[PDB]
Amino acid sequence: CPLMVKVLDAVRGSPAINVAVHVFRKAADDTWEPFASGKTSESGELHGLTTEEEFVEGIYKVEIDTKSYWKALGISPFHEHAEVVFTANDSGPRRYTIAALLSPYSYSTTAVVTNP
Amino acid sequence: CPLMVKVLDAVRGSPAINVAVHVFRKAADDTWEPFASGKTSESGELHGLTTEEEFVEGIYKVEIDTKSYWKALGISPFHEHAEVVFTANDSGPRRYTIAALLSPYSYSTTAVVTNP
Amino acid sequence: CPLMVKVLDAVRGSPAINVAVHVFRKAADDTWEPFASGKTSESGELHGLTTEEEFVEGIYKVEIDTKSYWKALGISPFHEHAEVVFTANDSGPRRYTIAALLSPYSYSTTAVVTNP
Amino acid sequence: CPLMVKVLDAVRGSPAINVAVHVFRKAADDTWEPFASGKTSESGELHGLTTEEEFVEGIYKVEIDTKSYWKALGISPFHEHAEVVFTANDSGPRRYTIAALLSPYSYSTTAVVTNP
Numbered sequence: 164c165p166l167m168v169k170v171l172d173a174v175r176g177s178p179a180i181n182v183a184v185h186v187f188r189k190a191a192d193d194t195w196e197p198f199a200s201g202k203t204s205e206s207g208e209l210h211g212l213t214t215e216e217e218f219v220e221g222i223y224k225v226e227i228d229t230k231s232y233w234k235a236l237g238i239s240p241f242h243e244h245a246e247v248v249f250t251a252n253d254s255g256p257r258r259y260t261i262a263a264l265l266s267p268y269s270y271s272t273t274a275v276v277t278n279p
Numbered sequence: 280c281p282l283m284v285k286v287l288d289a290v291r292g293s294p295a296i297n298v299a300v301h302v303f304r305k306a307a308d309d310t311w312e313p314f315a316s317g318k319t320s321e322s323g324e325l326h327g328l329t330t331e332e333e334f335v336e337g338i339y340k341v342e343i344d345t346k347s348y349w350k351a352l353g354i355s356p357f358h359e360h361a362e363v364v365f366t367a368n369d370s371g372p373r374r375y376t377i378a379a380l381l382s383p384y385s386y387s388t389t390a391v392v393t394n395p
Numbered sequence: 396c397p398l399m400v401k402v403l404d405a406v407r408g409s410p411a412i413n414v415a416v417h418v419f420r421k422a423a424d425d426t427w428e429p430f431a432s433g434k435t436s437e438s439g440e441l442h443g444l445t446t447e448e449e450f451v452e453g454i455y456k457v458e459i460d461t462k463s464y465w466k467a468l469g470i471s472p473f474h475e476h477a478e479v480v481f482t483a484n485d486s487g488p489r490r491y492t493i494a495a496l497l498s499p500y501s502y503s504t505t506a507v508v509t510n511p
Numbered sequence: 512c513p514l515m516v517k518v519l520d521a522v523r524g525s526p527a528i529n530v531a532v533h534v535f536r537k538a539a540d541d542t543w544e545p546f547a548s549g550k551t552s553e554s555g556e557l558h559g560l561t562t563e564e565e566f567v568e569g570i571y572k573v574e575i576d577t578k579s580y581w582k583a584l585g586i587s588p589f590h591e592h593a594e595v596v597f598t599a600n601d602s603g604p605r606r607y608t609i610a611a612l613l614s615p616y617s618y619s620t621t622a623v624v625t626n627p
């Protein structure tokens with residue numbers, strides 16, 4: 164499990180539960196091919212998106228559906244979503260944790276990258 | 280006047296200067312059509328991207344080239360760029376200020392939507 | 396001129412107005428002596444706290460009353476206030492801008508130290 | 512273990528290891544009495560600071576020594592430290608996780624509060 168996503172709600176001070184997350188990988192023809200997807204758990208975490216074998220070198224895009232999250236709570240947010248784009252495993256396989264801290268008009272994203 | 284971008288450097292504690300910024304508008308076929316662009320000033324600001332007249336309601340993508348910024352500084356970044364996607368709306372305030380706080384492995388983006 | 400404070404509201408996406416701010420200077424006996432104070436403007440800014448002449452090198456504490464801000468909005472905050480402690484230094488740039496991005500259960504503070 | 516602290520380095524994209532953390536509780540005479548302290552682990556986490564019985568209602572101050580952290584890395588940071596002040600357990604016992612995202616000239620602090 165080399166790719167993990169963690170989302171927190173900065174308004175309620177709690178994990179952001181049931182947030183949809185889509186991952187894409189840039190193709191040779193520079194198109195974004197669907198790679199994996201899922202939803203955050205009660206702890207705001209999304210594990211099991213991919214494997215070490217599948218998670219090859221490449222440029223990935225993790226798109227977090229923050230809009231649906233805020234709308235379900237009765238809030239009209241600014242962003243359509245929070246999307247992280249990055250090159251992965253270009254110096255060998257690494258473990259990535261993409262953390263997103265959400266607010267209606269602001270979000271922060273941090274990457275904690277460790278060598279397995 | 281209606282759209283401004285401000286970028287700060289959290290490592291050196293100063294405005295992020297000469298950062299490339301491109302704005303796109305989502306087309307009917309869901310592809311991103313180039314709309315406006317430029318580079319941040321000595322104060323880390325980028326104004327005059329569009330006019331009230333040209334900035335119609337729609338989905339806009341603001342792509343900030345954070346990677347080139349850090350690479351020039353000789354610092355190894357994580358993200359390929361910082362992308363801020365949002366829907367421009369007449370119902371809400373007129374002026375949009377997209378502020379991005381940058382760090383090599385983390386970034387935050389906040390919108391300050393005001394009428395005046 | 397040498398010290399400015401800017402506060403933003405990440406929930407409503409606007410400047411945080413009428414936020415109480417107090418600045419203290421650490422005394423020889425390590426107690427915090429009141430130095431300057433005021434409230435944020437309609438633009439979420441607070442200028443004219445001190446002069447270059449009065450702002451000598453030393454340890455300063457900037458206490459932002461985030462709790463009263465959220466309570467007035469009828470939103471339950473976590474923090475009692477946001478405290479930014481730092482050492483003013485002549486070796487580095489002259490002007491200090493303390494920016495605080497507020498959310499009920501989270502806040503960020505960045506310093507933009509520039510000479511001009 | 513109702514009080515946990517987590518610190519991440521936004522420059523390296525890794526946990527902030529060996530960061531000293533001091534906790535204080537406001538006394539009746541409004542002085543800050545030392546409550547507990549420790550250092551972050553290899554995962555950037557600090558557990559075992561207190562217990563449910565000891566962690567009574569009160570106003571607490573968690574002071575994170577970010578200055579020593581950056582100085583050890585050859586960087587002269589802006590903040591003397593990152594200090595969170597908050598009222599705890601005023602609506603019954605809760606579990607608190609204080610997360611701090613660090614950068615030389617900026618830091619964010621988030622509180623994830625759950626009902627045990």
Ligand SMILES: Oc1c(Br)cc(Br)cc1Br
Pocket residue numbers: 169260262264273275517519608610612621623
């Ligand atoms: O566990 C984490 C929390 Br809580 C906050 C941030 Br930011 C990142 C991670 Br990983």
Ligand SMILES: Oc1c(Br)cc(Br)cc1Br
Pocket residue numbers: 285287376378380389391401403492494496507
């Ligand atoms: O001027 C700004 C600062 Br400094 C920080 C953030 Br966040 C937004 C604005 Br506008």
